Design a protein around this ligand. Structure first.
Ligand SMILES: O=C(CCN1C(=O)COc2ccccc21)OCc1nc2scc(-c3ccccc3)c2c(=O)[nH]1
Ligand SMILES: O=C(CCN1C(=O)COc2ccccc21)OCc1nc2scc(-c3ccccc3)c2c(=O)[nH]1
Ligand SMILES: O=C(CCN1C(=O)COc2ccccc21)OCc1nc2scc(-c3ccccc3)c2c(=O)[nH]1
Ligand SMILES: O=C(CCN1C(=O)COc2ccccc21)OCc1nc2scc(-c3ccccc3)c2c(=O)[nH]1
Lengths: 604, 604
């Protein structure tokens, strides 16, 4: 997996060190190769550890004289690849075009070497363990490393300008998946100058190279790729009216659109590629004229439905408990009424109407949530903050708990408060999803969703051991006293709860001077103060101050991505008699079935 | 000590000012030296204050003509050193090679001056009072100041290329203990080119120069010294596979390893030398594959043992107190049971099993802690944060208090809560030691251990005088009233405790409107509010905010050092049938008994 790589590389190097002809080809001798070529009894096709040919070990250490003498001694060593596991289809041409010497590649092409030999192992394969991905073909190798006089020398010998390899990619996808981009823009331009030919082709995953430029986030290759579609109109003064093309920027023929494909990626450039001009102007116009006046009425309808659920939950049926309460610590003066007395009057008919509209809202929420999560994977939909993981989780939780409340009401079971309080508090804390489209409540809900999983997760794992270590001491100091004067510290769970409440200072310190408290309680409380309340509760404020100072641009760079996410979701969901196209047409203007855009510009 | 240096330097300068021949040699006269050399009655071997020879005072003020005329007048003044206290074995050759003139050194070597004269005083000695440490030999002087044409001129006269001096050092250790390093890398390279010869030699303390490079933290000399062992394998494309050597980086033959020697230093570069490549890759692999799956089960076993101790401490034997409580301020309804009624049932047998496993855990903690602190000094083990001083202190305290609890239980003494509460709260606050290997709770426990000794130590020395000055005023205002309406402010210790509680606002302000409080209490409380609660308690938050802003990189530069500390500690502690080696072997690959490492790299 990892140590197997060292296990095979040491074996290859040990075989190279042991074999004398390969050692001479490594050291670049002349008389030793001359005597081993003159003595014809020695074998020249001998293999090392991992398919190691003498031409391979010459080209790996760049021995031009040894390679030329080897091909003029026996030229039948270029068309034979390796056969072992990490380097399956490697060739001398492959390692020569990676090592970037023109003369050895010219000598190999003069000595009859094929240019369509494929390499399918663990070396040249898209995986996070290998450092580089160059492709599985010599033209992909040359155009990916960025040479200039090897690409013509290979294409004029017919080396598959439109090639295919593992995972269905091609040379344009390989040039897009690169971190240099400045000596790769010219290479992509030259290969597009050489040749549904090569741009509109999909891979095995279904990624046209424009959508791969999207999902990988290379903004400079995107900004060059836009300039092979940009129609330019007139210019006068300092202003110019460029006319872009959006027939790839929004799909409308396939459900998988470019914008839906780029708003739900997992990298750190899918929210920076949404700042270039012909996608920013488009989603700004479409958002400001089509996303606010439906999100506002959706938020109003959700808040109206939740106030119906809150009032229907308040007006709950209750009957007086006839069994007595002969216990000094028992209080229950109302009891949950039986189901057979739930239809008695007009008020109970109104409560029935409220229960019906609550159950209808719960089932339409569940049926509007489930078939969208069956398509996108659960990780991409529950994880990210651009899409709404920690709101869809509590929405599905609210729907399942309201359904369990309705079933528990119909089966005539006691204890309705146990799911009712949870369903109500989650359904009212889930209104925060409708605080995406407003720039006031925009970055603040991102800050609180970041602050919970960033600092409260770090802080409660060190609050739990302090309250769990101090509640036991408070209980041991107060298990030899009376529970008449000090109500707290009687049993262990109320001791734990009261120690946590004294930790957050929401309750007062226990004090009663009708008795005399023990010295051990007094000294451990005077230590508990300046260990757990003066220090740690005032260090939390400084830590969430510095997180707020340092993450003061991720919220402003993530809010635009989540508002484009809501625009794309509503454009896919709501019907298309109410969601028309974007941009001008081209059928009534002498162009034909290509929707355009016309963004006015101003420089100087 | 310090003023003695001024006392001897003024005496030397006064003797130079008083003696006429030395004054002429200072002023660089010609006719005065000519007449004092022609008049042969004058003595030339006369000594000043601290062994002051005329050749010494010529070479100290760089008088080439005076020195040449002195050696051509009487050449018997070069082989005689000084004899007084601060400058014992100083020579004209020593001060000439420090003053860096080639001609005077050539003249002294032509006039028969020895090159192995040693200087052992208070001047040339490793101590924090002297500014520089250059060594105790002329070759150490030349190679430490960094000359180029003096080192060959001295070594070709046989001036001890492999020398020894005080504290057992040599010239490579002297070149390592230097703050220049850029004109010292070439000097170290030239001396290693000139010559178990010189690299594998130890000093008197037991420091091979590689381990001295470690313990002194000079990263550039470390990064050059690594490149005399780095074996290079093939290269192709932009990636290269260097093959380092770890036979010095981890010892395995001596208990004192390089990594244990470098993780427990007291400087500010022992945590920066742990970022270079062939130690970072090694400890990253060894930590992620061998330190987490034993630290996790160690934390689980410690938390399980502490929950056994907490439950065994809760289930404590108690007998009802038969003596009466005829006192309006006495509450004791349960009394500690006698030892003879501690084995009565199955529950008391279970409590006995809990006491036995608690005492066994305490004695294995103490026997696992003590023989490790007997070897490393108490300062290095209790002080630093990389090693765990403020956790080993509270662990030894918990073990001694649990042993004192067991002895106090067997001797049938009352008052078990007095050590039991302390032992329980320290044993539960000591779980924080197992928050080193997790990157969530990593920097936060460093922040709280820094915040206590950095700000709470500064703050409680100015909280103590405010509460000690306000509790007395609150007592004087309320010693002429009734303790029936106001429970607080009755005697002085409860007045002090209630003033501290009102300082931290955990208790409410005393108010009772069934009576009339004095005007003096009212005005001093209205001053106590906006002097001690609005201001100082809200300045503490700002101070621990700015400490958190400024020490936001020492925690991220110290956490890696303490996780390498725990890796080295577990590698030394746990047995070696479960802790195997690191890196590949070299016996089955044609190298022989040298464990290697193979780190893959990528540039361009
Ligand atoms: O209308 C919806 C949302 C469901 N709901 C309602 O009905 C009523 O009010 C709500 C209030 C709070 C929470 C949910 C609702 O459908 C599901 C849905 N929400 C989203 S948000 C971003 C995306 C997205 C877009 C493109 C790619 C990937 C993800 C997304 C999605 O794909 N589906
Ligand atoms: O609880 C804890 C620590 C324990 N731990 C949980 O409990 C939930 O699974 C976990 C998964 C991994 C690690 C720890 C835990 O402390 C921090 C903390 N993180 C969160 S995330 C959501 C909540 C939450 C808020 C209100 C009600 C219910 C849950 C939450 C929380 O209350 N605390
Ligand atoms: O296993 C140990 C630690 C002792 N303990 C346990 O047994 C049980 O759980 C514990 C929980 C909290 C505290 C202690 C324990 O031994 C002692 C020990 N701890 C350390 S931490 C770093 C070093 C170190 C490494 C290299 C050089 C210098 C110091 C170190 C050490 O040398 N000894
Ligand atoms: O106490 C003080 C000041 C008095 N002073 C001690 O008392 C301990 O020796 C000292 C040594 C030098 C200077 C002052 C003191 O204020 C600050 C302060 N520093 C610390 S360090 C550990 C604790 C601690 C925490 C909980 C229980 C027991 C001790 C601590 C503390 O409570 N306060």
């Amino acid at each position: 997996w990892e140590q197997y790589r060292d296990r095979v590389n040491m074996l290859q190097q040990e075989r190279i060190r042991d074999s004398p002809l390969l050692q001479a080809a490594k050291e670049n001798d002349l008389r030793l190769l001359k005597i081993l070529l003159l003595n014809q009894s020695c074998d020249f096709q001998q293999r090392g550890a991992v398919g190691e040919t003498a031409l391979h070990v010459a080209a790996l250490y760049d021995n031009l004289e040894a390679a030329t003498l080897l091909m003029e001694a026996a030229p039948e060593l270029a068309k034979e690849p390796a056969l072992c596991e990490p380097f399956v289809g490697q060739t001398a041409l492959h390692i020569a075009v990676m090592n970037q010497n023109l003369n050895l590649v010219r000598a190999l092409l003069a000595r009859g070497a094929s240019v369509s030999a494929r390499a399918t192992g663990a070396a040249f394969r898209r995986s996070p363990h290998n450092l580089i991905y160059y492709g599985e073909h010599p033209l992909s190798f040359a155009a990916c490393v960025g040479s200039e006089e090897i690409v013509r020398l290979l294409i004029e010998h017919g080396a598959d300008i439109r090639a295919q390899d593992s995972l269905g990619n091609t040379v344009l996808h390989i040039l897009i998946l690169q971190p240099n981009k400045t000596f790769a823009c010219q290479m992509y331009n030259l290969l597009l100058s050489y040749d549904q030919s090569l741009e509109l082709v999909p891979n095995h995953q279904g990624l046209t190279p424009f959508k791969l430029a999207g999902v990988e986030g290379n903004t400079v290759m995107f900004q060059h790729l836009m300039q092979k579609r940009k129609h330019v109109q007139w210019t006068c003064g300092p202003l110019t009216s460029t006319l872009y093309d959006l027939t790839e920027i929004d799909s409308w023929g396939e459900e998988l659109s470019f914008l839906e494909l780029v708003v739900s990626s997992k990298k750190r450039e899918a929210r920076q590629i949404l700042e270039q001009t012909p996608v920013k102007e488009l989603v700004s116009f479409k958002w400001k004229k089509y996303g606010r006046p439906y999100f506002c009425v959706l938020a109003s309808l959700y808040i109206l439905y939740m106030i119906c659920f809150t009032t229907c939950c308040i007006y709950r049926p209750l009957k007086l408990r006839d069994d007595n309460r002969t216990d000094p610590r028992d209080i229950t003066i109302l009891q949950q009424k039986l189901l057979q007395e739930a239809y008695v009057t007009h008020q109970d008919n109104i409560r029935l109407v409220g229960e019906l509209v609550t159950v209808t809202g719960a089932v339409i929420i569940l049926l509007l949530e489930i078939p969208d999560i069956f398509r996108v994977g659960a990780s991409r939909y529950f994880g990210q903050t651009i899409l709404g993981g920690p709101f869809h989780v509590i929405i599905i939780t609210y729907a399942s708990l309201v359904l369990l409340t309705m079933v528990m009401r119909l089966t005539n079971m006691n204890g309705e408060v146990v799911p009712l309080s949870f369903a109500l508090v989650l359904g009212w804390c889930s209104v925060m999803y409708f605080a995406r489209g407003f720039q006031m409540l925009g970055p603040f809900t991102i800050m609180i969703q970041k602050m919970i999983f960033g600092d409260l997760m770090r802080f409660c794992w060190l609050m739990a051991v302090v309250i769990l270590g101090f509640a036991s001491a408070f209980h041991i100091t107060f298990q030899t006293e009376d529970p008449n004067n000090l109500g707290e510290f009687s049993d262990y769970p109320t001791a734990l709860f009261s120690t946590f409440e004294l930790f957050l200072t929401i309750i007062d310190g226990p004090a009663n001077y009708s008795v005399d408290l023990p010295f051990m309680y007094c000294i451990t409380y005077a230590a508990f103060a300046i260990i757990a309340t003066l220090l740690m509760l005032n260090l939390f404020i400084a830590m969430m101050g510095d997180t707020h100072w340092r993450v003061a641009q991720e919220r402003d760079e993530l809010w635009r991505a989540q508002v484009v996410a809501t625009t794309v979701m509503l454009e896919r969901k709501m019907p298309r008699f109410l969601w028309p196209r974007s941009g001008i047409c081209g059928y009534e203007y002498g162009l034909g079935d290509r929707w355009f855009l016309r963004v006015e510009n101003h420089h100087d």
